[PDB]
mmCIF file of C-alpha atoms in Angstrom:
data_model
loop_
_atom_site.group_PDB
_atom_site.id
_atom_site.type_symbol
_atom_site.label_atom_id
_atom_site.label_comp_id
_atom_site.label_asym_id
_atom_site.label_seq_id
_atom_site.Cartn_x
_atom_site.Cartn_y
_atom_site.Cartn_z
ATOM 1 C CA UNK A 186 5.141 25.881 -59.110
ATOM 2 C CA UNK A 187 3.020 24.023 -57.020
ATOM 3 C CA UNK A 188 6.068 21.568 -55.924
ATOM 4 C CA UNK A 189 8.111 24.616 -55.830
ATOM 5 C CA UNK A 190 6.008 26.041 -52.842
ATOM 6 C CA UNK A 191 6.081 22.704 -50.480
ATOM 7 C CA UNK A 192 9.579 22.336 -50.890
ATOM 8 C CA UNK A 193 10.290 25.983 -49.824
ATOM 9 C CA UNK A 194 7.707 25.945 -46.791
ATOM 10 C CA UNK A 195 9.242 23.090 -45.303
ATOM 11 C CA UNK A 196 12.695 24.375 -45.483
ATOM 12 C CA UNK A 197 11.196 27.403 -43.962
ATOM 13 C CA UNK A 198 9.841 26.326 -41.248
ATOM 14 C CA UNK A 199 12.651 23.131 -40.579
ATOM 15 C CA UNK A 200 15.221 26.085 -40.401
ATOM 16 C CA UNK A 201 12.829 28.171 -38.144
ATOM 17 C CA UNK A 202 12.700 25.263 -35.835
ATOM 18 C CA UNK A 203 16.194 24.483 -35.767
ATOM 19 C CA UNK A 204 17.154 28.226 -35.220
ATOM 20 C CA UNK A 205 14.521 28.393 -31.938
ATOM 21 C CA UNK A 206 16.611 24.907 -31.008
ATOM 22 C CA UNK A 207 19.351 26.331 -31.441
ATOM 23 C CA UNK A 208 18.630 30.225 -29.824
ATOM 24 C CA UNK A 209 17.381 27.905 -26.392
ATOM 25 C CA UNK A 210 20.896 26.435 -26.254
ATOM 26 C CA UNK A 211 22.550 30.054 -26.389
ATOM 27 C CA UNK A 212 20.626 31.057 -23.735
ATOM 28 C CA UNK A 213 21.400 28.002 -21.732
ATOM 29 C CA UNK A 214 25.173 28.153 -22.351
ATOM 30 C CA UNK A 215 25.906 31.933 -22.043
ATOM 31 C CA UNK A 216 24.177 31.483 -18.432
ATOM 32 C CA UNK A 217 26.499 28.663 -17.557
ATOM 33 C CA UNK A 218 29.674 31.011 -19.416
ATOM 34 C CA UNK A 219 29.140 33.699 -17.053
ATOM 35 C CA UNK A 220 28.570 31.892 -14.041
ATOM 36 C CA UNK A 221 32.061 29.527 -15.040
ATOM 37 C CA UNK A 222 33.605 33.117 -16.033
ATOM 38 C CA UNK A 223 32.783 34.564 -12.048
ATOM 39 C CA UNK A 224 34.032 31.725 -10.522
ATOM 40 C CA UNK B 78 0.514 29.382 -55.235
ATOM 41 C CA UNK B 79 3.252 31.935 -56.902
ATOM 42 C CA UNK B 80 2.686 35.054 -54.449
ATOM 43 C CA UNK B 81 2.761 31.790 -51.832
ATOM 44 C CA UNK B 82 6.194 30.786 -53.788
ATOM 45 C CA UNK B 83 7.684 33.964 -53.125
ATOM 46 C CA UNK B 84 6.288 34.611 -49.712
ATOM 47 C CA UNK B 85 7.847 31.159 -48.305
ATOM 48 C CA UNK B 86 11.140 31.444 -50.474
ATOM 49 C CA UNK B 87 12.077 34.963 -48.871
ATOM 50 C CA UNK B 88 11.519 33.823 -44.992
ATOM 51 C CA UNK B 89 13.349 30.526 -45.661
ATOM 52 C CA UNK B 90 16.425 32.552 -47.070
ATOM 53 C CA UNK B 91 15.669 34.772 -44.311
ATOM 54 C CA UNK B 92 15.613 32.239 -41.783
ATOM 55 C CA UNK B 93 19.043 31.050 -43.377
ATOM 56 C CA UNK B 94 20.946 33.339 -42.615
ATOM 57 C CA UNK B 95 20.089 33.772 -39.267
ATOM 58 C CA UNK B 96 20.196 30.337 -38.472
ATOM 59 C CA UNK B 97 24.021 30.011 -39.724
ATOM 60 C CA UNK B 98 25.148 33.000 -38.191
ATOM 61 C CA UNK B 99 23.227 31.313 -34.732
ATOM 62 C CA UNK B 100 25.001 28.473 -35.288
ATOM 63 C CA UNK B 101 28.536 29.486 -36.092
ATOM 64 C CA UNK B 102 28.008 31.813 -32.929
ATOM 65 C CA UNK B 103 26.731 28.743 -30.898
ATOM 66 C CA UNK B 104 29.764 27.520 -31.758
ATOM 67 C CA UNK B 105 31.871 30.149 -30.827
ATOM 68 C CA UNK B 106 30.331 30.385 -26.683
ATOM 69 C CA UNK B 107 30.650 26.509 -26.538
ATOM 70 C CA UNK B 108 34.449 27.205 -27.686
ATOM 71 C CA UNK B 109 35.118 30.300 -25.338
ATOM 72 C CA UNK B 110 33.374 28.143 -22.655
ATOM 73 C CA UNK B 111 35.700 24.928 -23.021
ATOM 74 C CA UNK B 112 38.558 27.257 -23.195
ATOM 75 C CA UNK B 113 37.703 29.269 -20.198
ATOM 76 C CA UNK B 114 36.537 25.957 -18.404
ATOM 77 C CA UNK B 115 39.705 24.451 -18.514
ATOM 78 C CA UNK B 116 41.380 27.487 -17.513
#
């Protein structure tokens, strides 16, 4: 149970760190898509 | 270490599913943006 736990923190917190990359890029794209859309 | 087990097990499932539905929707504005940028 012990090995259980390590394994599912690490998954935890590599998908919490690639959702926060990820959630940066949205915010840098859909600022770019609106701008693009306007002109 | 299984309260700890359970703890980390629910916010990586958790984390999951909002991290696909990020990604698949990353996916989608980077797809509407190539589209509208070569229109």
């Amino acid at each position: 149970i012990e090995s259980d736990l390590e394994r599912a923190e690490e998954r935890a917190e590599l998908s919490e760190g690639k959702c926060a990359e990820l959630e940066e890029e949205l915010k840098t794209v859909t600022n770019n898509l609106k701008s693009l859309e306007a002109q």
